[model samples]
Target chain A: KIIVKHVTVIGGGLMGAGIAQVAAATGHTVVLVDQTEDILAKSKKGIEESLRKVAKKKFAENPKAGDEFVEKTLSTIATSTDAASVVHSTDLVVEAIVENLKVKNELFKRLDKFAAEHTIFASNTSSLQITSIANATTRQDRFAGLHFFNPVPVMKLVEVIKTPMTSQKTFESLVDFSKALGKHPVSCKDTPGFIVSRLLVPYLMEAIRLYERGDASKEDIDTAMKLGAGYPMGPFELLDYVGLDTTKFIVDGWHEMDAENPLHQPSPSLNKLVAENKFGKKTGEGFYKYK
Target chain B: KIIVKHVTVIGGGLMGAGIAQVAAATGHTVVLVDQTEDILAKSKKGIEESLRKVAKKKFAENPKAGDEFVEKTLSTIATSTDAASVVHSTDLVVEAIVENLKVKNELFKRLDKFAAEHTIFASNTSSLQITSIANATTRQDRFAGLHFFNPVPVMKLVEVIKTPMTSQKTFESLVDFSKALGKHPVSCKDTPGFIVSRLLVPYLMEAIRLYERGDASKEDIDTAMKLGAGYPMGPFELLDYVGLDTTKFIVDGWHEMDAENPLHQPSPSLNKLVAENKFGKKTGEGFYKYK
Candidate 1:
């Protein structure tokens, strides 16, 4: 088992921060990078709050150990703005940056020159193709995708996606890395939606189209799925929780990529909600009211 | 609310027996119809066994009461071979007959003339369009779809589907009937797969396609969805439980109707499974093995 000693996560967003925290908690030296110090500070604070909540439960019998764990974990994570500055020292770089392919490519392209020969690269992307992003770098064999769900620590599963060019060693390292972070890693080929998102996004999109076509009221449709299909949450509830904008982004992206697939076709209900900025729970409005 | 005092269930299949059991258990006069006395007797036996199971839990506190409950429920349900004999007396006719359009239409068309003026007709068809089934009769305004899930008493949801021609009274009566049977009534417009199956079936098909492409193994895909999405069962597991033939039937039917929709496209693996008599749990072979 190849142990990844040092981990650097680019883009201190929700996903990035969570990754950094988990990597740090698991005793890896982690550096969270962002565009500015302020964003990094916020990410660090969020990580601290999340860690405390986790420790409260995990080390309830020994509060002293919980405090020490928190202190040690926080000490392992350092924040920085320059990717090039940290790339040379890190064994692994997991990018959780913006979904823009060009921006992602540019960051990896720059790091490929500065990083060590054996340094592996991975993306925590949910939708964008790992291969297209890996195409920007010279180390396609070392490049893979480690896609994480939202509120990363809570979601125990991680999709370890490998492109055709991704070497077996790189894939094994990622699987080991994910297991080290306390996640159940599932290997997947670099395909559209990988496994979960590909199957999930289309279903969510189809639910929207079903509602838009007046097949059923939003409430009834959600109720049917929850009770009948044994779904923890209904489609509309999930749409509201996942954010209509985020769903629209994924579906629209797929539709643009393949115009003929009706499953990916944009839904009028989703488009209208997004147009009104009723993103989801964060915005207090969506397929359902959150307040 | 219009009370559906009498329910005439046509067919003796699992769904039909379940519908009959629930109707009888709820204190409604039910007539279970089939082609022959032997088939009707078998349907009655199945209903009796299901009623005993429900009675076991429902009246556990009082075994004598449980016995009485089963006796009363069974006493209310009569068996018949003649649809014409039952239609003249029943207030509702729920067709859980064979899924073939011709068979369903033929049954409804014959009963449309014999059923009383106040009789409301419903088809428990899962995939075929309700409108086409409703078109066979002049009583289109009284025709609707009451789609029930497997193990009807266990699954709480009942999709009360209304076509454009279905009257408000018929819709309300179906809703009320569903509630009376202790089920949540979800109103849906007459559409393919209604709401639950519309969102669910295609996703199951996609999961098969994902596995077919070698994106991930069947076990991993099932794990990802079950843990990642909090689904009670993974797509393959669901396909196995819900018979490969049934899934193949629905997907193939949809693809035939709309070949352009990729979501409805049949997977080669699913076809092969059905062709080999591996129709899932019933046949002890499918995506996974069953004991």
Candidate 2:
């Protein structure tokens, strides 16, 4: 019974593709957009593979139903290189592009003029300010944040962020859209880092600072947090798993905005790891080596 | 064989009694020391009750063996009023007295001249710098930290702290002693909060600050961390469990040292609760009410 049935997720990267897959799987029409045809094709294939795996479990008793479900979900999705072409018909626009303020504003500015008057705009941004991103578009009431975590399909939580200018109707719509995709949504104002990142990132950074101070060995620090604090993964282990580059990007962005706050400052070890391209488990070497 | 066979635990408080029980339970001869005979007798009774519970599970196959085990462990522990007199024949002395720097130093300084040349000294101080405590005695090489978590027998971590003056043999002895007590030992430098407190306390404070800012509801924030971050308990729940006064004490101490650090600044809500004497679960009220 929601008005926002058609979702156009910009950027065919991991987050964008996953968002499109879930929206399509949940019976909404999703148009996944990217810069090139090759990237869009790859995104389509990735979604198909993911869908097949999901369908296998969901429709375990009936093989024919499983194939039909995959085919039906794939049929709901369409791919394109042009943003303006899809915006005229779309009800919601969820941007999951690179974590660049300038790039996001530029894209939203153009889409603002092309999209219909009622189409709500949302960003899947994790670190950047939502109000600044909304500044580019004229529809302030319709602009909000549908911030999703990494591995969008697996991670079930989505932060539904609303700026002061965002209307109650827009906030409700964003919340409903998230629920439609089967994500547990938590609402928040347009604060920096919103909720999760604001709490989690600083904690992770402090762990690094503790290690840098030689208070404890990295192994000991990890074990202490895991055992003493009952954390699933130690801060160092999480840093490596989250990718040093991504972690650096988030901290650097915050530090740039709030230069006075010590918690936002970039760690030297994290910077070194990112510079050397030892990102994390994907890079084969980070804080800990992976076989 | 380990040289630290005869252990003398100073101060028959909760931490001290738990340490004595574990040391005696693990086949080491332990002498529990306190200011008065009444307190020492109470510590002995408490140890007997705890040992019976442990013995119940340990020797479940034979009730007679369980009784014997409890009796044997209790037989290893001797009580005394004068630390200087008892420490002369002791191999290691663990002080878990009042968390006052002067009291700990005074006790260690008196025992230094009376104890054997090979007697290793340790403090279970959670906040005070181990080096400053060691400064009271000439035996710097023999002084280290054996910080055990509250409910010591249940929590399996022991942070083995070494000051610059603490010798390699001293550090190894502390580590070996922790292992003998069946606790996971982590090595750390003599720094503020060491590994666990340094990382955890600040993170908990930040969570409170976020709640105060009205970014998210307390319940929502708690759920977000538990579900989003895989933490065993949410920050508020932990604050209540850890005693609000204890948390305020740590933050106040840090704030006093570094007034500029935003993380250490005490929360208004926390201060108000403490002022009202709603310490935490122990007092039946904190962030959330407990019946």
Candidate 3:
């Protein structure tokens, strides 16, 4: 018994666009705000392509209903360049601009000035302090994280991160919001890397170190992880998919916070790859050299 | 193309029985050997029950075939108390004997004396080194590991461990044999904990330490790993599932190997739980107390 009539998403990049599409697909009016029209158009196209993929996978007993869902969801979505356009009269504003603290803080400061008090302020920042994001808001009780995983429609998990200032009501509402979008909502603390990345990064890094130490060949290590463990992707494959620059950035960030943490000590290979701009699938090179 | 017409299972406990059942179900004749009739009967019953569960899942699609599969696979099995049983002349001997090095060595010694030189000598030892098992036989080139997961027939991946002495021909044949049995196989070295345990145990131990440090409530930590990490079960729940005692034992073993390895430092709470014999589902008490 929750009402989610309208949603405003700030930023039209992959994560924001996916979130907007998910909300719209669930029959909520969505306003997707980005910096430019070209970006918005690109996001909209991506959303359409993703929905088509979902439609293919979704049950086909009533194919018309699937088409209708796609049509209705697409119709519900609205796009804009002006931040103020989405700021007024929206129930929830999910900001997914960038991972930069200064930019996010500045955006929040602007949103704080413009958006209504009741309008929920949520950040889609993957690895940042939720309390810092909530700091920009006067009524910290209304702030909480509604973190949707990538390819939002397919990945069923939405981590509802709650800070110390996050009210119980707000947390519950976000959980409801996630469920409404057909996601499995899991609540977690404001811990860095939250839960998955906190445990996962070190494991992946260790696997890389194992490869670096000649314990196993890269292919064998990747194969071992996939077949040894029930992981969908091996550590190196994950690194390639996630991008080496991003991996370096994350490990470097962790190192800065805790130099003594042996787990976060950046692998020499990782440093070299990042230095060479062989940033995984994006630049077409990483742990394994790709053709 | 590969044909695993015969599979030699060295032990008759839960692990041995499960492996034999799966191999037989996939059209391989199974030779099961244990120390006693009581253990063999118990293993057979465990396997029969598992086959029934598998049959139940596919009950909708030709119930008769399910029953036939169970009966036919059970019929394929020939159990013996003596390790010298080369009656079926197995192509692959998946050794699931006791964890003791001497016992496994004895069994392999007998198999080496009796079985064909081409026959694969594979151990199901979870912790013991593949090199030690290889040393038991004169034909060291043919020896490898066929590590089956718990409740086998349900879980499909098999870690085919390769020691330095194991020949490429033996490794290829083992992989082919596994594929014939419809199980995914990954080749790994005789490294400690092989692949999965090496990755998972450290993470589980970290969760235990986190619980000990009073950083987060047990329920929250469990919830975090499950929800945040999308793990089938949280670390503590898994600790409870795999006895806290077992976790401590594994960590302590790794710590003994290299005390400087920070990740393996045994948690005091974990040690205390093990000492108290609050070992998990079997003991009826663990991270989550069962009614």
Candidates by DockQ, descending order? 1, 2, 3
User: Total backbone clashes of model 1?
Assistant: 0
Looking at model 2 chain B, report the run of 10 residues with the lowest lDDT sum. B223-232
TM-score of 2: 0.83
lDDT per residue, candidate 1, A129-189, as tens digits?
A: 9899999989999999998876687788899988889998998998899899999998877
- Which portions of model 1 miss their true places by more than 4 Å? A24-27, A48-77, A243-246, A267-278, A282-291, B35-82, B259-263, B275-277
Instruction: Give the winner by DockQ.
Output: 1
Selected candidate, larger TM-score, 1 vs 2: 1
Off by over 4 Å in 2: A1-4, A12-14, A21-29, A37-78, A213-217, A276-278, A281-291, B1-91, B97-100, B110-117, B150-155
In order of TM-score, best first, we have 1, 3, 2
lDDT of 2 by residue, B40-72 (tens): 998889888888888778888899999998889
User: RMSD, each candidate, Å?
Assistant: 3.5, 4.3, 4.0
What are the Cα lDDT values of the candidates?
A: 0.86, 0.86, 0.77
- Residue B54's lDDT within candidate 2 is 87
Model 3 residue A94 lDDT score? 90
At residue B232, candidate 2 shows an lDDT of 76
lDDT of 3: 0.77
The local distance difference test score of model 1 is: 0.86
